[model samples]
Target: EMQLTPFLILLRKTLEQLQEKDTGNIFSEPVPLSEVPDYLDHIKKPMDFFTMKQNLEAYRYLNFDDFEEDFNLIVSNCLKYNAKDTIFYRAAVRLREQGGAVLRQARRQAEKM
Candidate 1:
Protein backbone atom coordinates (compact mmCIF):
# COMPACT_ATOMS: atom_id res chain seq x y z
CA GLU A 1 0.00 0.00 0.00
CA MET A 2 1.19 3.50 -0.74
CA GLN A 3 2.06 5.37 2.39
CA LEU A 4 -0.06 8.45 2.74
CA THR A 5 2.29 10.94 4.24
CA PRO A 6 1.14 14.04 6.06
CA PHE A 7 2.47 16.24 3.31
CA LEU A 8 0.59 14.36 0.60
CA ILE A 9 -2.61 14.52 2.62
CA LEU A 10 -2.25 18.24 3.09
CA LEU A 11 -1.44 18.75 -0.56
CA ARG A 12 -4.49 16.76 -1.66
CA LYS A 13 -6.75 18.66 0.69
CA THR A 14 -5.34 21.99 -0.38
CA LEU A 15 -5.82 21.11 -4.03
CA GLU A 16 -9.40 20.12 -3.27
CA GLN A 17 -10.08 23.46 -1.65
CA LEU A 18 -8.52 25.36 -4.51
CA GLN A 19 -10.55 23.42 -7.05
CA GLU A 20 -13.71 23.95 -5.06
CA LYS A 21 -13.12 27.68 -5.04
CA ASP A 22 -13.17 27.70 -8.85
CA THR A 23 -10.55 30.41 -8.96
CA GLY A 24 -10.86 30.41 -12.76
CA ASN A 25 -7.37 29.16 -13.07
CA ILE A 26 -6.17 25.79 -14.24
CA PHE A 27 -6.85 23.06 -11.65
CA SER A 28 -10.54 22.68 -12.42
CA GLU A 29 -10.64 19.44 -10.50
CA PRO A 30 -9.12 18.26 -7.29
CA VAL A 31 -5.75 16.64 -7.80
CA PRO A 32 -5.89 12.89 -7.61
CA LEU A 33 -4.04 11.40 -4.67
CA SER A 34 -2.73 8.65 -6.89
CA GLU A 35 -1.22 11.21 -9.25
CA VAL A 36 0.68 13.07 -6.61
CA PRO A 37 3.72 10.95 -7.24
CA ASP A 38 3.69 11.80 -10.95
CA TYR A 39 3.18 15.44 -10.15
CA LEU A 40 6.16 15.42 -7.86
CA ASP A 41 8.11 13.52 -10.44
CA HIS A 42 7.46 16.26 -12.98
CA ILE A 43 8.69 18.82 -10.51
CA LYS A 44 11.85 16.83 -9.99
CA LYS A 45 12.59 16.10 -13.61
CA PRO A 46 12.66 17.58 -17.05
CA MET A 47 9.39 18.56 -18.78
CA ASP A 48 8.77 19.51 -22.37
CA PHE A 49 6.53 22.25 -23.69
CA PHE A 50 3.46 20.02 -24.13
CA THR A 51 3.76 18.65 -20.63
CA MET A 52 4.09 22.08 -19.15
CA LYS A 53 1.25 23.29 -21.31
CA GLN A 54 -1.01 20.53 -20.03
CA ASN A 55 -0.06 21.25 -16.46
CA LEU A 56 -0.91 24.89 -16.91
CA GLU A 57 -4.00 24.50 -19.06
CA ALA A 58 -5.98 27.00 -17.05
CA TYR A 59 -3.51 29.75 -17.77
CA ARG A 60 -4.08 29.43 -21.49
CA TYR A 61 -6.69 32.14 -21.47
CA LEU A 62 -7.68 33.63 -24.79
CA ASN A 63 -6.06 36.93 -23.92
CA PHE A 64 -3.10 35.27 -22.22
CA ASP A 65 -3.50 37.70 -19.32
CA ASP A 66 -2.64 34.97 -16.86
CA PHE A 67 0.73 34.13 -18.40
CA GLU A 68 2.87 36.24 -16.16
CA GLU A 69 1.44 34.82 -13.01
CA ASP A 70 1.54 31.31 -14.43
CA PHE A 71 5.15 31.65 -15.53
CA ASN A 72 6.15 33.13 -12.21
CA LEU A 73 4.52 30.29 -10.35
CA ILE A 74 6.44 27.69 -12.33
CA VAL A 75 9.77 29.43 -11.86
CA SER A 76 9.14 30.26 -8.22
CA ASN A 77 7.95 26.78 -7.34
CA CYS A 78 10.99 25.25 -8.96
CA LEU A 79 13.26 27.55 -7.02
CA LYS A 80 11.37 26.99 -3.80
CA TYR A 81 11.81 23.25 -4.11
CA ASN A 82 15.50 23.57 -4.93
CA ALA A 83 14.89 22.28 -8.45
CA LYS A 84 16.24 25.43 -9.99
CA ASP A 85 18.85 23.54 -11.97
CA THR A 86 16.53 20.85 -13.22
CA ILE A 87 15.53 20.56 -16.88
CA PHE A 88 11.98 21.46 -15.94
CA TYR A 89 13.17 24.73 -14.46
CA ARG A 90 15.33 25.47 -17.45
CA ALA A 91 12.47 24.73 -19.80
CA ALA A 92 10.23 27.11 -17.93
CA VAL A 93 12.78 29.84 -18.30
CA ARG A 94 13.24 29.10 -21.97
CA LEU A 95 9.53 29.03 -22.60
CA ARG A 96 9.01 32.38 -20.95
CA GLU A 97 11.82 33.98 -22.87
CA GLN A 98 10.78 32.54 -26.20
CA GLY A 99 7.12 33.19 -25.65
CA GLY A 100 7.77 36.77 -24.67
CA ALA A 101 9.94 37.33 -27.70
CA VAL A 102 7.34 35.85 -30.00
CA LEU A 103 4.58 37.96 -28.52
CA ARG A 104 6.69 41.06 -28.88
CA GLN A 105 7.40 40.27 -32.48
CA ALA A 106 3.72 39.79 -33.15
CA ARG A 107 2.90 43.12 -31.57
CA ARG A 108 5.55 44.83 -33.63
CA GLN A 109 4.19 43.31 -36.81
CA ALA A 110 0.68 44.37 -35.87
CA GLU A 111 1.84 47.92 -35.19
CA LYS A 112 3.48 47.97 -38.62
CA MET A 113 0.21 46.98 -40.30
Candidate 2:
Protein backbone atom coordinates (compact mmCIF):
# COMPACT_ATOMS: atom_id res chain seq x y z
CA GLU A 1 0.00 0.00 0.00
CA MET A 2 1.10 3.59 -0.55
CA GLN A 3 0.45 4.30 3.12
CA LEU A 4 3.24 2.69 5.20
CA THR A 5 5.37 1.79 2.18
CA PRO A 6 6.19 5.32 1.13
CA PHE A 7 6.64 6.34 4.72
CA LEU A 8 8.94 3.41 5.43
CA ILE A 9 11.02 3.92 2.31
CA LEU A 10 11.34 7.62 3.04
CA LEU A 11 12.28 6.87 6.63
CA ARG A 12 14.84 4.27 5.63
CA LYS A 13 16.54 6.57 3.15
CA THR A 14 16.68 9.38 5.67
CA LEU A 15 18.08 7.11 8.37
CA GLU A 16 20.64 5.78 5.90
CA GLN A 17 21.82 9.29 5.12
CA LEU A 18 22.04 9.97 8.86
CA GLN A 19 24.14 6.87 9.42
CA GLU A 20 26.41 7.58 6.45
CA LYS A 21 27.34 11.05 7.60
CA ASP A 22 30.78 12.39 6.73
CA THR A 23 31.52 14.57 9.76
CA GLY A 24 28.28 16.51 9.43
CA ASN A 25 27.10 18.54 12.41
CA ILE A 26 23.65 17.58 13.74
CA PHE A 27 23.07 21.28 14.42
CA SER A 28 24.02 22.10 10.86
CA GLU A 29 22.33 19.50 8.64
CA PRO A 30 19.26 18.19 10.42
CA VAL A 31 16.97 16.78 7.76
CA PRO A 32 13.31 17.55 8.24
CA LEU A 33 11.13 14.48 8.04
CA SER A 34 8.33 16.34 6.23
CA GLU A 35 10.61 18.16 3.81
CA VAL A 36 11.79 15.10 1.93
CA PRO A 37 10.25 15.97 -1.44
CA ASP A 38 11.83 19.40 -1.42
CA TYR A 39 15.18 17.68 -1.85
CA LEU A 40 14.46 17.56 -5.59
CA ASP A 41 13.41 21.18 -6.06
CA HIS A 42 16.30 22.71 -8.07
CA ILE A 43 15.43 26.30 -7.18
CA LYS A 44 14.65 25.64 -3.50
CA LYS A 45 16.62 27.48 -0.88
CA PRO A 46 18.86 25.47 1.41
CA MET A 47 17.24 24.92 4.81
CA ASP A 48 18.76 26.62 7.82
CA PHE A 49 18.98 23.85 10.36
CA PHE A 50 19.90 25.90 13.42
CA THR A 51 17.23 28.48 12.79
CA MET A 52 14.68 25.75 12.21
CA LYS A 53 15.68 24.09 15.43
CA GLN A 54 15.31 27.36 17.30
CA ASN A 55 11.87 27.98 15.85
CA LEU A 56 10.76 24.44 16.61
CA GLU A 57 12.10 24.69 20.12
CA ALA A 58 10.26 27.98 20.59
CA TYR A 59 7.01 26.47 19.36
CA ARG A 60 7.40 23.47 21.63
CA TYR A 61 7.88 25.79 24.59
CA LEU A 62 5.00 28.13 23.74
CA ASN A 63 2.64 26.35 26.13
CA PHE A 64 5.26 24.74 28.37
CA ASP A 65 7.93 26.70 30.18
CA ASP A 66 9.52 23.48 31.35
CA PHE A 67 10.20 22.61 27.73
CA GLU A 68 12.01 25.89 27.34
CA GLU A 69 14.21 25.27 30.39
CA ASP A 70 14.91 21.69 29.46
CA PHE A 71 15.77 22.62 25.88
CA ASN A 72 17.96 25.53 26.96
CA LEU A 73 19.84 23.43 29.48
CA ILE A 74 20.50 20.73 26.94
CA VAL A 75 21.72 23.22 24.34
CA SER A 76 23.88 25.07 26.83
CA ASN A 77 25.42 21.91 28.21
CA CYS A 78 26.00 20.59 24.73
CA LEU A 79 27.92 23.74 23.72
CA LYS A 80 29.68 24.88 26.84
CA TYR A 81 32.58 24.39 29.27
CA ASN A 82 30.47 21.79 31.12
CA ALA A 83 31.18 19.27 28.40
CA LYS A 84 33.31 17.32 30.82
CA ASP A 85 30.32 16.70 33.05
CA THR A 86 29.37 13.51 31.30
CA ILE A 87 26.69 12.44 33.77
CA PHE A 88 24.82 15.70 33.41
CA TYR A 89 23.80 15.17 29.80
CA ARG A 90 23.18 11.49 30.32
CA ALA A 91 20.91 12.17 33.28
CA ALA A 92 19.24 15.07 31.52
CA VAL A 93 17.42 13.05 28.88
CA ARG A 94 16.32 10.47 31.39
CA LEU A 95 14.85 12.87 33.93
CA ARG A 96 13.49 15.31 31.40
CA GLU A 97 9.80 14.66 31.93
CA GLN A 98 10.05 14.54 35.69
CA GLY A 99 12.36 17.49 36.10
CA GLY A 100 10.40 19.42 33.52
CA ALA A 101 7.25 19.14 35.61
CA VAL A 102 9.13 20.27 38.68
CA LEU A 103 10.50 23.23 36.74
CA ARG A 104 7.03 24.34 35.73
CA GLN A 105 5.76 24.40 39.30
CA ALA A 106 8.85 26.25 40.48
CA ARG A 107 9.01 28.64 37.58
CA ARG A 108 6.48 31.04 38.97
CA GLN A 109 7.88 30.85 42.50
CA ALA A 110 11.22 32.38 41.61
CA GLU A 111 12.98 34.71 39.24
CA LYS A 112 14.76 32.31 36.94
CA MET A 113 17.40 34.11 34.99
Candidate 3:
Protein backbone atom coordinates (compact mmCIF):
# COMPACT_ATOMS: atom_id res chain seq x y z
CA GLU A 1 0.00 0.00 0.00
CA MET A 2 1.22 3.46 -0.83
CA GLN A 3 1.61 5.60 2.24
CA LEU A 4 -0.10 8.92 1.74
CA THR A 5 1.30 11.98 3.38
CA PRO A 6 -0.59 13.74 6.13
CA PHE A 7 -1.52 16.42 3.64
CA LEU A 8 -3.17 13.97 1.27
CA ILE A 9 -4.98 12.28 4.11
CA LEU A 10 -6.44 15.55 5.31
CA LEU A 11 -7.26 16.63 1.79
CA ARG A 12 -9.10 13.40 1.14
CA LYS A 13 -11.10 13.77 4.33
CA THR A 14 -11.97 17.37 3.60
CA LEU A 15 -13.06 16.56 0.09
CA GLU A 16 -15.32 13.84 1.43
CA GLN A 17 -17.13 16.46 3.46
CA LEU A 18 -17.22 18.78 0.52
CA GLN A 19 -18.75 16.04 -1.57
CA GLU A 20 -21.56 15.53 0.90
CA LYS A 21 -22.33 19.21 0.65
CA ASP A 22 -22.07 19.09 -3.11
CA THR A 23 -25.51 20.52 -3.91
CA GLY A 24 -24.29 20.41 -7.50
CA ASN A 25 -20.97 21.92 -6.71
CA ILE A 26 -17.48 20.99 -7.71
CA PHE A 27 -16.28 17.85 -5.98
CA SER A 28 -19.93 16.92 -5.51
CA GLU A 29 -18.58 13.50 -6.32
CA PRO A 30 -15.52 11.84 -4.97
CA VAL A 31 -12.46 13.49 -6.47
CA PRO A 32 -9.96 10.69 -6.38
CA LEU A 33 -6.29 11.49 -5.91
CA SER A 34 -5.63 9.85 -9.22
CA GLU A 35 -7.53 12.73 -10.88
CA VAL A 36 -5.34 15.33 -9.20
CA PRO A 37 -2.64 15.31 -11.83
CA ASP A 38 -5.18 15.56 -14.61
CA TYR A 39 -6.92 18.47 -12.91
CA LEU A 40 -3.62 20.21 -12.29
CA ASP A 41 -2.54 19.69 -15.86
CA HIS A 42 -5.82 21.09 -17.15
CA ILE A 43 -6.32 23.90 -14.67
CA LYS A 44 -2.74 25.07 -15.11
CA LYS A 45 -3.10 27.63 -12.36
CA PRO A 46 -2.96 27.89 -8.60
CA MET A 47 -5.66 28.15 -5.98
CA ASP A 48 -5.57 29.42 -2.44
CA PHE A 49 -5.09 27.31 0.68
CA PHE A 50 -8.25 25.59 1.89
CA THR A 51 -7.62 25.31 5.60
CA MET A 52 -4.20 25.70 7.13
CA LYS A 53 -3.82 25.30 10.87
CA GLN A 54 -7.07 23.60 11.81
CA ASN A 55 -6.66 20.71 9.40
CA LEU A 56 -3.22 19.93 10.75
CA GLU A 57 -4.13 20.53 14.38
CA ALA A 58 -3.57 16.86 15.21
CA TYR A 59 -0.14 16.83 13.64
CA ARG A 60 0.71 20.09 15.40
CA TYR A 61 3.61 20.31 12.99
CA LEU A 62 4.26 19.44 9.36
CA ASN A 63 6.71 20.31 6.64
CA PHE A 64 5.29 23.24 4.75
CA ASP A 65 6.99 21.98 1.63
CA ASP A 66 5.36 18.61 2.13
CA PHE A 67 1.90 20.17 2.22
CA GLU A 68 2.55 22.70 -0.49
CA GLU A 69 1.95 20.49 -3.51
CA ASP A 70 -1.25 18.76 -2.35
CA PHE A 71 -2.55 21.94 -0.78
CA ASN A 72 -2.34 23.48 -4.22
CA LEU A 73 -4.41 20.62 -5.54
CA ILE A 74 -7.12 21.35 -2.96
CA VAL A 75 -6.98 24.96 -4.01
CA SER A 76 -7.40 23.96 -7.62
CA ASN A 77 -10.58 22.12 -6.71
CA CYS A 78 -11.86 25.10 -4.75
CA LEU A 79 -11.29 27.28 -7.74
CA LYS A 80 -12.95 24.83 -10.08
CA TYR A 81 -15.92 24.63 -7.71
CA ASN A 82 -16.07 28.38 -7.21
CA ALA A 83 -15.74 28.23 -3.45
CA LYS A 84 -15.78 31.76 -2.09
CA ASP A 85 -12.58 33.46 -1.09
CA THR A 86 -12.56 33.54 2.69
CA ILE A 87 -10.91 35.52 5.43
CA PHE A 88 -8.88 32.43 6.24
CA TYR A 89 -7.62 32.52 2.69
CA ARG A 90 -6.68 36.15 2.98
CA ALA A 91 -5.01 35.66 6.34
CA ALA A 92 -3.20 32.61 5.13
CA VAL A 93 -1.90 34.54 2.14
CA ARG A 94 -0.94 37.59 4.15
CA LEU A 95 0.99 35.53 6.64
CA ARG A 96 2.25 32.92 4.25
CA GLU A 97 5.83 33.86 5.01
CA GLN A 98 5.20 34.27 8.71
CA GLY A 99 5.10 30.58 9.68
CA GLY A 100 2.61 27.78 10.29
CA ALA A 101 1.73 28.60 13.87
CA VAL A 102 0.70 32.11 12.96
CA LEU A 103 -1.42 30.85 10.09
CA ARG A 104 -2.99 28.29 12.35
CA GLN A 105 -4.05 30.99 14.76
CA ALA A 106 -5.35 33.01 11.87
CA ARG A 107 -7.40 30.08 10.62
CA ARG A 108 -8.75 29.43 14.09
CA GLN A 109 -9.83 33.03 14.44
CA ALA A 110 -11.27 33.24 10.96
CA GLU A 111 -13.10 29.95 11.15
CA LYS A 112 -14.68 30.83 14.47
CA MET A 113 -17.34 32.67 12.56
Candidate 4:
Protein backbone atom coordinates (compact mmCIF):
# COMPACT_ATOMS: atom_id res chain seq x y z
CA GLU A 1 0.00 0.00 0.00
CA MET A 2 1.10 3.58 -0.68
CA GLN A 3 1.85 5.93 2.16
CA LEU A 4 -0.03 9.20 2.63
CA THR A 5 3.14 11.14 3.39
CA PRO A 6 4.37 11.21 -0.22
CA PHE A 7 1.07 12.53 -1.45
CA LEU A 8 1.38 15.36 1.04
CA ILE A 9 4.87 16.05 -0.20
CA LEU A 10 3.72 16.26 -3.84
CA LEU A 11 0.80 18.48 -2.92
CA ARG A 12 3.05 20.85 -1.00
CA LYS A 13 5.44 21.01 -3.92
CA THR A 14 2.64 21.70 -6.40
CA LEU A 15 1.06 24.36 -4.20
CA GLU A 16 4.31 26.21 -3.51
CA GLN A 17 5.57 26.03 -7.08
CA LEU A 18 2.29 27.26 -8.53
CA GLN A 19 2.24 30.12 -6.04
CA GLU A 20 5.49 31.33 -7.56
CA LYS A 21 3.65 32.05 -10.81
CA ASP A 22 2.22 35.53 -11.43
CA THR A 23 -1.24 34.04 -11.76
CA GLY A 24 -0.75 32.35 -8.41
CA ASN A 25 -1.20 35.79 -6.92
CA ILE A 26 -4.65 35.69 -8.41
CA PHE A 27 -5.64 32.18 -7.23
CA SER A 28 -3.68 32.27 -3.97
CA GLU A 29 -6.86 32.98 -2.07
CA PRO A 30 -10.57 32.59 -2.40
CA VAL A 31 -12.62 34.77 -4.69
CA PRO A 32 -14.02 37.75 -2.85
CA LEU A 33 -17.72 36.93 -3.13
CA SER A 34 -18.50 40.44 -1.92
CA GLU A 35 -16.52 41.88 -4.78
CA VAL A 36 -17.58 39.46 -7.50
CA PRO A 37 -21.21 39.00 -6.73
CA ASP A 38 -21.88 36.75 -9.71
CA TYR A 39 -18.76 34.68 -9.24
CA LEU A 40 -20.56 32.12 -7.13
CA ASP A 41 -23.43 32.15 -9.54
CA HIS A 42 -21.09 31.06 -12.29
CA ILE A 43 -18.83 28.84 -10.23
CA LYS A 44 -20.79 26.59 -7.92
CA LYS A 45 -17.66 25.17 -6.33
CA PRO A 46 -14.96 27.76 -5.94
CA MET A 47 -11.61 26.28 -5.05
CA ASP A 48 -8.43 28.13 -4.14
CA PHE A 49 -4.86 27.46 -3.08
CA PHE A 50 -5.34 28.83 0.43
CA THR A 51 -8.34 26.62 1.05
CA MET A 52 -6.34 23.63 -0.09
CA LYS A 53 -3.51 24.77 2.13
CA GLN A 54 -5.79 24.78 5.13
CA ASN A 55 -7.18 21.38 4.17
CA LEU A 56 -3.68 19.97 3.74
CA GLU A 57 -2.48 21.31 7.07
CA ALA A 58 -5.52 19.75 8.69
CA TYR A 59 -4.82 16.41 6.96
CA ARG A 60 -8.19 16.55 5.30
CA TYR A 61 -7.27 14.60 2.21
CA LEU A 62 -8.04 10.92 2.67
CA ASN A 63 -5.90 9.93 -0.29
CA PHE A 64 -3.76 11.31 -3.10
CA ASP A 65 -6.88 11.46 -5.26
CA ASP A 66 -8.40 13.83 -2.76
CA PHE A 67 -5.55 16.28 -3.27
CA GLU A 68 -5.73 15.76 -7.02
CA GLU A 69 -9.44 16.48 -7.04
CA ASP A 70 -9.06 19.89 -5.38
CA PHE A 71 -6.06 20.85 -7.46
CA ASN A 72 -8.03 20.15 -10.64
CA LEU A 73 -10.98 22.08 -9.29
CA ILE A 74 -8.98 25.24 -8.63
CA VAL A 75 -7.90 25.45 -12.24
CA SER A 76 -11.11 23.96 -13.54
CA ASN A 77 -13.36 26.46 -11.82
CA CYS A 78 -11.30 29.42 -12.99
CA LEU A 79 -11.41 28.21 -16.53
CA LYS A 80 -15.10 27.58 -16.20
CA TYR A 81 -16.17 30.96 -14.81
CA ASN A 82 -13.97 33.33 -16.84
CA ALA A 83 -14.31 34.13 -20.51
CA LYS A 84 -11.66 32.94 -22.93
CA ASP A 85 -10.40 36.49 -23.55
CA THR A 86 -9.93 37.28 -19.87
CA ILE A 87 -6.74 37.09 -17.85
CA PHE A 88 -8.34 34.65 -15.42
CA TYR A 89 -9.12 32.29 -18.26
CA ARG A 90 -5.61 32.52 -19.64
CA ALA A 91 -4.12 31.94 -16.23
CA ALA A 92 -6.28 28.91 -15.77
CA VAL A 93 -4.93 27.41 -18.98
CA ARG A 94 -1.35 27.89 -17.86
CA LEU A 95 -1.99 26.42 -14.45
CA ARG A 96 -3.70 23.39 -15.96
CA GLU A 97 -0.67 22.69 -18.09
CA GLN A 98 1.99 23.60 -15.55
CA GLY A 99 0.19 22.35 -12.49
CA GLY A 100 -0.59 19.11 -14.23
CA ALA A 101 3.12 18.84 -14.94
CA VAL A 102 3.88 18.86 -11.24
CA LEU A 103 1.05 16.42 -10.58
CA ARG A 104 2.30 14.00 -13.21
CA GLN A 105 5.88 14.28 -12.03
CA ALA A 106 4.82 13.83 -8.46
CA ARG A 107 2.79 10.72 -9.29
CA ARG A 108 5.65 9.23 -11.27
CA GLN A 109 8.14 9.75 -8.49
CA ALA A 110 5.79 8.52 -5.82
CA GLU A 111 5.18 5.33 -7.78
CA LYS A 112 8.90 4.69 -7.91
CA MET A 113 8.95 4.87 -4.12
Q: Could you say which candidate leads in TM-score?
A: 4
Off by over 4 Å in 2: 22-113
The most accurate candidate by lDDT is 4
Give the candidate order by descending TM-score. Answer: 4, 1, 3, 2
Q: Least lDDT summed over 10 consecutive residues: which range in candidate 4?
A: 15-24
Q: Write the per-residue lDDT of candidate 4 for residues 33-74, one digit (tens) a residue.
A: 998999977887888889988999899975667888998898
Error of 4 at 61 (Å): 1.6
Per-residue lDDT of model 1, residues 34-83, tens digit only: 84556665454433233334544443322223423444454445454446
Q: List the residue pairs that clash in candidate 3.
A: none
The C-alpha RMSD in Å for every predicted model, in order, reads 16.5, 17.5, 11.1, 1.8
My TM-score estimates for the predictions, one after another, are: 0.34, 0.22, 0.24, 0.87
Q: List the residue pairs that clash in candidate 4.
A: none
> For model 4, how big is the CA root-mean-square deviation?
1.8
> For residues 1-113, what per-residue lDDT tens digits would candidate 3 score against the true structure?
32336444544444344333333333223344485656555455443333333445555324434444444454445545432486434433433333334435433433433
Error of 4 at 49 (Å): 0.5
Q: Between 3 and 4, whose TM-score is larger?
A: 4
lDDT of predicted model 2: 0.39
Off by over 4 Å in 1: 1-34, 37-82
